[PDB]
Amino acid sequence: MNIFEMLRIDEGLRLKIYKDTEGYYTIGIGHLLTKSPSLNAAKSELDKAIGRNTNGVITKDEAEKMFNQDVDAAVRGILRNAKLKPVYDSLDAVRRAALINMVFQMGETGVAGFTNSLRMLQQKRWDEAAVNLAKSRWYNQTPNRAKRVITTFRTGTWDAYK
Ligand SMILES: [Cl-]
């Protein structure tokens, strides 16, 4: 299992614009297009992302390609963030993937906001962190996924995704 697979499981794959769980326009593999209510705006950002007139629909290859950039961007965002970097550096390979997932779903900023959990992860207090991470809107709104990510930090294994 790896980061790609993991996220592919949490996000799914859709080749037509759709609304995510927060109601925002997305496409592909969790690729957010815009927070705006406007479908045109969405279609517009999509074309600009893809580099052609898509009329709201893309191919598998195109999705995958965006997915790859988005993963890369997430890592890169982590490495550039003063609060994240150190946590990430302290972690083993599996758990890193867990931090990437959260950043891909919520943004670097959102994540950097879980101060207390981060500290805990840095200290390798698995159970404690898992409990703190659950007291969050994130967990309340997308509980199944949050559960998968949290178990992963808790156990250091891929069991939640097997
Ligand atoms: Cl883009």
Ligand SMILES: [Cl-]
């Ligand atoms: Cl969920």
